[PDB]
Design an enzyme around this catalytic site. Structure first.
Site, PDB file in Angstrom:
ATOM      1  N   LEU A 193       0.802  -1.223   0.000  1.00 53.99           N
ATOM      2  CA  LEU A 193       0.000   0.000   0.000  1.00 53.99           C
ATOM      3  C   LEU A 193       0.847   1.291   0.000  1.00 53.99           C
ATOM      4  O   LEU A 193       0.390   2.319  -0.481  1.00 53.99           O
ATOM      5  CB  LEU A 193      -1.030  -0.013   1.152  1.00 53.99           C
ATOM      6  CG  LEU A 193      -2.073  -1.163   1.093  1.00 53.99           C
ATOM      7  CD1 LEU A 193      -2.928  -1.209   2.335  1.00 53.99           C
ATOM      8  CD2 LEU A 193      -2.938  -1.108  -0.157  1.00 53.99           C
ATOM      9  N   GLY A 194       2.070   1.205   0.482  1.00 52.59           N
ATOM     10  CA  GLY A 194       2.994   2.328   0.557  1.00 52.59           C
ATOM     11  C   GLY A 194       4.194   2.023   1.429  1.00 52.59           C
ATOM     12  O   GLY A 194       4.290   0.926   2.004  1.00 52.59           O
ATOM     13  N   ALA A 213      10.640   5.755   5.513  1.00 49.92           N
ATOM     14  CA  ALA A 213      11.933   5.488   6.131  1.00 49.92           C
ATOM     15  C   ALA A 213      11.768   4.374   7.197  1.00 49.92           C
ATOM     16  O   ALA A 213      12.666   3.541   7.342  1.00 49.92           O
ATOM     17  CB  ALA A 213      12.478   6.765   6.756  1.00 49.92           C
ATOM     18  N   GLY A 222       9.787   1.723   7.094  1.00 47.67           N
ATOM     19  CA  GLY A 222       9.603   0.412   6.492  1.00 47.67           C
ATOM     20  C   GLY A 222       8.510   0.401   5.447  1.00 47.67           C
ATOM     21  O   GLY A 222       8.492   1.251   4.555  1.00 47.67           O
ATOM     22  N   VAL A 247       4.056  -0.611   4.382  1.00 49.18           N
ATOM     23  CA  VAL A 247       2.649  -0.896   4.725  1.00 49.18           C
ATOM     24  C   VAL A 247       2.118  -1.845   3.637  1.00 49.18           C
ATOM     25  O   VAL A 247       2.242  -1.539   2.453  1.00 49.18           O
ATOM     26  CB  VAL A 247       1.736   0.347   4.960  1.00 49.18           C
ATOM     27  CG1 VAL A 247       0.324  -0.062   5.394  1.00 49.18           C
ATOM     28  CG2 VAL A 247       2.344   1.284   5.997  1.00 49.18           C
ATOM     29  N   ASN A 262      -4.254  11.857   7.556  1.00 49.82           N
ATOM     30  CA  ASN A 262      -4.140  10.935   8.691  1.00 49.82           C
ATOM     31  C   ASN A 262      -5.471  10.398   9.099  1.00 49.82           C
ATOM     32  O   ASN A 262      -5.623   9.889  10.209  1.00 49.82           O
ATOM     33  CB  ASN A 262      -3.441  11.600   9.877  1.00 49.82           C
ATOM     34  CG  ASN A 262      -1.954  11.640   9.679  1.00 49.82           C
ATOM     35  OD1 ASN A 262      -1.357  10.762   9.027  1.00 49.82           O
ATOM     36  ND2 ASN A 262      -1.323  12.657  10.242  1.00 49.82           N
ATOM     37  N   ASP A 296      -2.801   7.789  11.925  1.00 49.56           N
ATOM     38  CA  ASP A 296      -1.548   8.569  11.891  1.00 49.56           C
ATOM     39  C   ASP A 296      -0.548   7.725  11.121  1.00 49.56           C
ATOM     40  O   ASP A 296      -0.147   6.661  11.593  1.00 49.56           O
ATOM     41  CB  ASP A 296      -1.016   8.903  13.309  1.00 49.56           C
ATOM     42  CG  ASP A 296       0.023  10.018  13.421  1.00 49.56           C
ATOM     43  OD1 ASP A 296       0.323  10.666  12.391  1.00 49.56           O
ATOM     44  OD2 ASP A 296       0.495  10.279  14.549  1.00 49.56           O
TER      45      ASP A 296
HETATM   46  C1  LIG Z   1      -0.765   6.820   2.148  1.00 47.94           C
HETATM   47  C2  LIG Z   1      -0.930   5.791   1.048  1.00 47.94           C
HETATM   48  C3  LIG Z   1       0.437   5.210   0.753  1.00 47.94           C
HETATM   49  O1  LIG Z   1      -1.412   6.441  -0.135  1.00 47.94           O
HETATM   50  C4  LIG Z   1      -1.921   4.696   1.452  1.00 47.94           C
HETATM   51  O2  LIG Z   1      -1.424   3.900   2.556  1.00 47.94           O
HETATM   52  C5  LIG Z   1      -2.399   3.187   3.256  1.00 47.94           C
HETATM   53  C6  LIG Z   1      -3.623   2.813   2.731  1.00 47.94           C
HETATM   54  C7  LIG Z   1      -4.505   2.096   3.516  1.00 47.94           C
HETATM   55  C8  LIG Z   1      -4.185   1.743   4.819  1.00 47.94           C
HETATM   56  C9  LIG Z   1      -5.214   0.963   5.578  1.00 47.94           C
HETATM   57  N1  LIG Z   1      -5.160   0.921   6.962  1.00 47.94           N
HETATM   58  O3  LIG Z   1      -6.090   0.390   4.949  1.00 47.94           O
HETATM   59  C10 LIG Z   1      -2.961   2.132   5.347  1.00 47.94           C
HETATM   60  O4  LIG Z   1      -2.677   1.706   6.649  1.00 47.94           O
HETATM   61  C11 LIG Z   1      -1.854   2.518   7.484  1.00 47.94           C
HETATM   62  C12 LIG Z   1      -2.483   3.862   7.792  1.00 47.94           C
HETATM   63  C13 LIG Z   1      -1.654   4.623   8.810  1.00 47.94           C
HETATM   64  N2  LIG Z   1      -1.602   3.852  10.033  1.00 47.94           N
HETATM   65  C14 LIG Z   1      -2.410   4.242  11.100  1.00 47.94           C
HETATM   66  O5  LIG Z   1      -3.162   5.209  11.055  1.00 47.94           O
HETATM   67  C15 LIG Z   1      -2.333   3.385  12.337  1.00 47.94           C
HETATM   68  C16 LIG Z   1      -2.918   4.082  13.515  1.00 47.94           C
HETATM   69  C17 LIG Z   1      -2.152   5.047  14.137  1.00 47.94           C
HETATM   70  C18 LIG Z   1      -2.670   5.748  15.199  1.00 47.94           C
HETATM   71  C19 LIG Z   1      -3.960   5.488  15.645  1.00 47.94           C
HETATM   72  O6  LIG Z   1      -4.464   6.188  16.740  1.00 47.94           O
HETATM   73  C20 LIG Z   1      -4.788   7.561  16.444  1.00 47.94           C
HETATM   74  F1  LIG Z   1      -3.886   8.264  15.724  1.00 47.94           F
HETATM   75  F2  LIG Z   1      -5.983   7.659  15.815  1.00 47.94           F
HETATM   76  F3  LIG Z   1      -4.843   8.263  17.592  1.00 47.94           F
HETATM   77  C21 LIG Z   1      -4.721   4.495  15.050  1.00 47.94           C
HETATM   78  C22 LIG Z   1      -4.197   3.800  13.970  1.00 47.94           C
HETATM   79  C23 LIG Z   1      -1.014   2.526   9.837  1.00 47.94           C
HETATM   80  C24 LIG Z   1      -1.728   1.736   8.772  1.00 47.94           C
HETATM   81  F4  LIG Z   1      -2.968   1.451   9.248  1.00 47.94           F
HETATM   82  C25 LIG Z   1      -2.067   2.839   4.550  1.00 47.94           C
END
Ligand SMILES: CC(C)(O)COc1ccc(C(N)=O)c(O[C@H]2CCN(C(=O)Cc3ccc(OC(F)(F)F)cc3)C[C@H]2F)c1
Ligand SMILES: O=c1[nH]cnc2scc(-c3ccccc3)c12
Length: 276
Positions: free
Chosen positions: A17-18, A21, A23, A25, A144, A157
């Site tokens: 997914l992405g 630095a 690592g 996802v 986020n 986040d």
């Molecule tokens: C940007 C791109 C490359 O275009 C798309 O990348 C994608 C696309 C989809 C997904 C998906 N989950 O389907 C994805 O997953 C990541 C999103 C970010 N992460 C968190 O938010 C975890 C987290 C951190 C703090 C929290 O607590 C708080 F902050 F809410 F307080 C709660 C959760 C980790 C992971 F889940 C990345």
């Protein structure tokens, strides 16, 4: 508190997914996680660094994500510490980040007023939850937030380099006192929520997009306010302004902001962006 442990072989990596630095996802299939769901999609955050300080910070983070349980907070399912990389398992949000979603459903089909209000209200809900636990996000932005099945918006986040200025600060989302003193409170989170509202009603446009990072600092520190987006009814702009009070003690509380947005979401103002 007591973090769930997923067996490495229960995680089948399907795609990436992405990355950063930190690592990578991944989109993955995860077995024996939820009852009646023998196989389910998840997003896996994989950590490059497997050192002792990296393992300790991970456990701290995993324990914190384990406590945060809410409808509009991205679901944490557990960890995999069967060697490098250390894996964090979250729910898969099929539409990706809110910023990308907003832009891709913008007038550039397009999201209507009621949908925008629902999005906004869901983010406000997640923030009421965070404010209740005295949890300061420090980086509230649509980038986020995540969008899942049914236009279900949740706060996350990721950790979009154009959105941060050098420690890398998201200055355009930050109130004057955070830019100047590096102090983050629920009140600065409220400011950020108001910028998140502006982002929603501009369909993910960057706040102060006409200006450079150093020019935007000047705007914010001189009390210059973001203009009312064309798709934003005045009733919502009123809510944004309340989030943007120069003095933290004079900004509305998120519970109030949510209440006003939840009210607007059920009975939306008759407002047509085309008329203004
Ligand atoms: C940007 C791109 C490359 O275009 C798309 O990348 C994608 C696309 C989809 C997904 C998906 N989950 O389907 C994805 O997953 C990541 C999103 C970010 N992460 C968190 O938010 C975890 C987290 C951190 C703090 C929290 O607590 C708080 F902050 F809410 F307080 C709660 C959760 C980790 C992971 F889940 C990345
Ligand atoms: O994620 C990707 N992006 C672009 N091309 C490709 S080819 C293979 C992958 C992949 C497949 C499974 C897990 C992880 C990665 C991939």
């Amino acid at each position: 508190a007591c973090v769930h442990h997923i067996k490495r072989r229960d995680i089948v990596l399907k795609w990436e997914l992405g990355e950063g630095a930190f690592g990578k996802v991944f989109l993955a299939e995860c077995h024996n996680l939820l009852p009646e769901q023998d196989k389910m999609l998840v997003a896996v955050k994989a950590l490059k660094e497997a050192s002792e300080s990296a393992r300790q910070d991970f456990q701290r983070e995993a324990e914190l994500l384990t406590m945060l349980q809410h409808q509009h907070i991205v679901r944490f399912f557990g960890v995999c510490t069967e060697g490098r990389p250390l894996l964090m398992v979250f729910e898969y949000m099929r539409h990706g980040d809110l910023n990308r979603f907003l832009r891709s459903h913008g007038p550039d089909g397009p999201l209507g007023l009621g949908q925008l209000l629902a999005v906004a209200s869901q983010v406000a809900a997640g923030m009421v939850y965070l404010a209740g636990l005295h949890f300061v996000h420090r980086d509230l932005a649509t980038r986020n937030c995540l969008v899942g099945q049914g236009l279900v918006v949740k706060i996350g986040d990721f950790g979009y380099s154009t959105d941060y200025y050098r420690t890398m600060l998201p200055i355009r989302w930050m109130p004057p006192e955070s830019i100047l003193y590096r102090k983050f409170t629920t009140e600065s989170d409220v400011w950020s929520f108001g910028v998140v509202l502006w982002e929603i009603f501009t369909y993910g446009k960057q706040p102060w997009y006409q200006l450079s990072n150093t020019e935007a600092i000047d705007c914010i520190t001189q009390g210059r306010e973001l203009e009312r987006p064309r798709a934003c009814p005045p009733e919502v702009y009123a809510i944004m302004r309340g989030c943007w009070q120069r003095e933290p003690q004079q900004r509305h509380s998120i519970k109030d902001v949510h209440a006003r947005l939840q009210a607007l979401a059920q009975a939306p103002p008759v407002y047509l962006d085309v008329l203004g």
